[PDB]
Amino acid sequence: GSHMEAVQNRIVEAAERVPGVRGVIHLRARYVGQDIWADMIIGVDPENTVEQAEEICEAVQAAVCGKIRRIESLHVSAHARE
| Residue 62 lies near a copy of itself (rule: CB under 8 A) | no
Instruction: Give dist(CA 56, CA 59) in Å, integer.
Output: 5
Instruction: Give dist(CA 55, CA 35) in Å, integer.
Output: 25
Instruction: Give dist(CA 10, CA 13) in Å, integer.
Output: 5
Among the listed ranges 1-9, 26-34, 50-58, 63-71, the one in contact with a copy of itself (CB under 8 A) is 50-58
- Site track for a copy of itself across 1-40, x = CB under 8 A: ----------------------------------------
Provide the minimum distance between the beta carbon of 11 and a copy of itself in the complex, in angstroms, as a whole number: 19
Question: Which DSSP state fits 81?
Answer: -
> Cα-Cα-Cα-Cα dihedral of 6, 11, 17, 18, to 10°?
180
| Residue 54 lies near a copy of itself (rule: CB under 8 A) | yes
Which residues are near a copy of itself by CB under 8 A?
A: 44-51, 53-54, 77-80
